[PDB]
Write a protein that binds this ligand. Sequence first.
Ligand SMILES: Cc1cc(C(C)(C)C)c(O)c(C)c1CC1=NCCN1
Lengths: 257, 215, 54, 334, 233
Amino acid sequence: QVTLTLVCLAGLLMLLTVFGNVLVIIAVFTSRALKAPQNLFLVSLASADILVATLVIPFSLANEVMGYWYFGKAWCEIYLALDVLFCTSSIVHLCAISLDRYWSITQAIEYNLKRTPRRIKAIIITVWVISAVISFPPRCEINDQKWYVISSCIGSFFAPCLIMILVYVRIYQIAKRRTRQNREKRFTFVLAVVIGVFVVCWFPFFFTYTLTAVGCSVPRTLFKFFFWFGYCNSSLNPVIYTIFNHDFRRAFKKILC
Amino acid sequence: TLSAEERAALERSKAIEKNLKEDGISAAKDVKLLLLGAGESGKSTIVKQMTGIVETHFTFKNLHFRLFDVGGQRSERKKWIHCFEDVTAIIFCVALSGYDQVNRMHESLMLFDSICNNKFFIDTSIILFLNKKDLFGEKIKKSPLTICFPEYTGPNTYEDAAAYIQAQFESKNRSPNKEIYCHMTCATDTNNIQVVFDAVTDIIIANNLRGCGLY
Amino acid sequence: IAQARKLVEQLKMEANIDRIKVSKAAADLMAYCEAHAKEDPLLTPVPASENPFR
Amino acid sequence: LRQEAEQLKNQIRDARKACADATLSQITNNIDPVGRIQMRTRRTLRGHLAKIYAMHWGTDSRLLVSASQDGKLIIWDSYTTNKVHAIPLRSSWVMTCAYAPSGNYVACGGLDNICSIYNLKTREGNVRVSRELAGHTGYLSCCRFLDDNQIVTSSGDTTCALWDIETGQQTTTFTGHTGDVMSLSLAPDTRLFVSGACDASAKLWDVREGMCRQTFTGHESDINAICFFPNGNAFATGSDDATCRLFDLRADQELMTYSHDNIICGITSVSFSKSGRLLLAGYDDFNCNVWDALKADRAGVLAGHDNRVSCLGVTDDGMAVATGSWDSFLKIWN
Amino acid sequence: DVQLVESGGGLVQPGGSRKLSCSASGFAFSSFGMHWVRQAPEKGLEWVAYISSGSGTIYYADTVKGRFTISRDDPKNTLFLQMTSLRSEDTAMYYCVRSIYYYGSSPFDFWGQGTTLTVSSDIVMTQATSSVPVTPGESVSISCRSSKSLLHSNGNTYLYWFLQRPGQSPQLLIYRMSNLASGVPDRFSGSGSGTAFTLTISRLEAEDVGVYYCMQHLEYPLTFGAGTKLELK
Ligand SMILES: Cc1cc(C(C)(C)C)c(O)c(C)c1CC1=NCCN1
């Protein structure tokens, strides 16, 4: 009976995600100050977000809105793989961005000699192909082979999460060591947010498959909530990675005016 | 569409664009420094230690440095100062010893203030060199202190006055997020490149978290 | 001394100019501007066609 | 006696005042004001990588050259935005450029205190340096081609010189300003020219005689740009005072005052239209206004660049106008 | 100064394979697009091949396609045309030309010397007659005709004129039918309509006697016209 409100919510998500990602894209392309080799990761992540929000979401919403997949074996079998690809792409991009930061903050000169767009593009292609190899193998259903689901879950979430935690902890420690007072609070808040939104919006889902699938099976109606939460990160992340960057702040102000 | 000659012209334009882009990417790797002393300061000493603008570049630990010293320009600096707006950092030299020739300390301090507070050029870190340690040290103990600065009211010698004038110089640094490094040279030390290297690596680190603001 | 002599020698020359009246000069400028106001494209926009910058 | 110098100043000021009736505040009021004028960008040249300080149109009214701190000169094709040539400079510090009327030569200079001449039409199909005019002491400020073998320059020495390119030696010098000279413009007759200096005054010069003929004053602060009238009978002056003024070369007095309260910032360049009705002037506030020549009304405005408009030029045919800014972008407005 | 030298000629039986090499010296060879032009042993001229400045674009005529290839190596300052499977009519004299394209360029300005060789739709140009009697000191005009109008939308009528003195390599005279090639007397004048074109020679001297051609550059393949020889009746 509230299906109209649900579709309104879905459309709001569509518009917010697409607007944010396109704003980021235009800001990065249209400004000279943002002409650095480190912005291509943001470009790729925004693209991913655009694709996933524009085409994956509508079919998922159509599914489970009445309980049946009105299409046949076309295209469910490729839709599942496409969704998996466009999701894990964001996670891999976040991990790569964090690693690049870390390497930039520590050992600045040596790495500094290796920021040519050639390496950045190679990294992006590697991230897309690793996502492809993760996704491709082997009443629209989902796979149940435990040896597949658990491995995919761990390799897609736990390792990137561990890397992000370690690198950001290392960065915070270095910033504290160079702190030797007012900004101490000002920037401790920023780091949490970057590592906070990522885990809160995504930790429950993988956790659950890792649970409720191999161990004791405990299905609950909150899965739907976990699934829905799994998507909004794509819309939150573009904003998180740009609100704290002055040049992006000026670009957005110019676009506004 | 377009004719064959126009197609050839477009291809030539694309080749020119690619060559220019590659040249720019290659050039943007090195670090540019500006040396702005005052009068008889040890700018000549520093540059030799290593009729218009003079450029001398050197490579230290696979890092290319380009140094500029606009000393020959006798015209007013408020014009043409804006040229060096996108510079990694600047280097300033004073002395220590000479502080009674006129005075010299007041002139250097006002010049430093003027260059450190500009509408642009406001967020560039500063490296400050105190060369000619030996002459200052010998001048103090025989003719203390005076100093021209009144209301000193501190210990006579030696690091007392050294740090006092140092702090006087780190003063009048209004803006945050912009550090002033310092070092005292005897005009015979052979490690100035080391301190410059440390300062530049610290500055680039600071820039990195700046983007990753952090902020 | 030398600077004063040069300055006075220069200033002696500017005393020779007439000058000419200002109203007549303004009339000349306005007349020329009105006369040439026809062929200037910025003043009168050209048609969308025959414009090198489409 | 300096008192005799100031007595001569007083008497000449009195004569000038006696030779003034207009005002220029009631006359010209009856003409049809142009009102607001709409301008739209047409092309955007995005090849550079750093600040650009000077540009110049060719006599053909299609090609132009721009100089930037990256140490390169680009010969653009405005109709197609094609990079005709890319010239690597010996010294990366440049502050001016000029385009020869014949189109065979282009000159540029800056803080290096020398003016380099480049030959475009060469047997080997590649540009080369023809002459390195090195006589000045200060930084170069402006250059202009009198003809294929005569170039005028202004530097920080508070002086200007006329050169013989093939000989490579100065043939005349101007030493009256007593203050840094920043810009100059050649009269259409190619016989007289004027220059602007930081001494808050401008002087007219005679090319053949090599001596000043008239000195203009009444301006509060530095002057950054000057340009002649199409008829070669008047000129306008830029400033850091945030004001523009134009003087008559025969009546020898100030005429107009282009002042608006809302704008308090330096003026980087100025230019006229083909008929002289439209006055153009860059500003430090990132947008260049358009002023009526004889109404002192801000007719229009041009949005962009980011920061900051520093050089502009109008084609000989007047078709379009180009502007440049420290963001490494050129725009064509029609 | 600028001068092109080449030596790869010889006598090869039908269907043989050879290589042609002309070496540049005296200019920025790496910044010029190079062509090859074949002059049949008796008469005539026809475009053969073309390689762009960065070797990023290559074109061929019909009879040449599939049997010949063109290559270059900028560091060595050499141009290569590969002879393979040559047929009976391929025997001819060959020239390698230099050409650069931008606003107000002068392509086909300078030609090579030539190296002999023995063995064993498209725009069409018309000229007539092939020999007209002329004497010194009196004006004359030569006309060339095409099928499709050369007037492009830009207003550039792509037409070129060349003069080949008896026993010497040709040289450019007029490009785009309205300009004048460098180092040429001002008596020559190019004019014509969008399909028909003519010349105008004044104060003729004994040095102007030769055979002329008309060529277009609007669209590949480049097609040469017939030769009109001048004499000293
Ligand atoms: C649905 C899904 C399932 C898995 C398995 C393999 C864990 C079943 C995945 O790895 C991935 C990436 C997805 C993609 C997705 N989940 C919620 C929203 N979009």
